[PDB]
Amino acid sequence: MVRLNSQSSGSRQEGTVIRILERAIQRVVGTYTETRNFGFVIPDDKKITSDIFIPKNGKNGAAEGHKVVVKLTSYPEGRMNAEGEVETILGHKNDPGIDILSVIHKHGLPG
RNA sequence: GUUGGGCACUCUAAGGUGACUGCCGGUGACAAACCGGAGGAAGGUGGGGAUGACGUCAAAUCAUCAUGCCCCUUAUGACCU
């Protein structure tokens, strides 16, 4: 649900998200990255602007540069990013056919 | 510590070493960089003080001092209370 702002700064009508009724995204594919004490995953859907925090026990074997599926445990809240767990490792992002395989996982196509 | 007690530690202060993106992940010209690893007291210009250029104000000082020419020169010298 979106509240309608009285003033628009442009041609189109502006609005603010007041409430979330239904959550669409529950899985996110991306590229895993390893920091010192925690992971992240950079989402292939760039419409997800924020990097998904992976806690160290959610890594499940994912190395640097591996395309990974990630299940959302939490959503973003304030300035905190979304956290998750690596559900699947696809492989490395430079391996032939992982590009397409990443698509197959992004939509949730049958294996 | 008061005393014997080597003197360990601490302190004192001479002489050294120590940080360099050096090394390791990513990233990116395969480089630089950047992001984050470690190690270390210290992390990415260690932190402070010291040491700049050519400037102009005929800026200020003859009550720092000195000073060419003036003036005072039994006083514009000097001494006391």
UniProtKB/Swiss-Prot annotation:
Reported induction: Constitutively expressed, part of a 5 gene operon with multiple promoters. Not ethanol-stress induced.
Compartments it resides in: Cytoplasm
For this UniProt entry, which residues form the secretion signal?
A: none
User: What is seen without this gene?
Assistant: No visible phenotype. Increased half-life of type I toxin-antitoxin system RNAs of BsrG/SR4.
Which family is this sequence assigned to?
Belongs to the RNR ribonuclease family. RNase R subfamily.
Quote the function comment for this protein: 3'-5' exoribonuclease that releases 5'-nucleoside monophosphates and is involved in maturation of structured RNAs. Involved in degradation of type I toxin-antitoxin system bsrG/SR4 RNAs.
Q: What is this protein called?
A: Ribonuclease R
The species this protein belongs to is Bacillus subtilis (strain 168)
The UniProt gene name for this protein comes to rnr
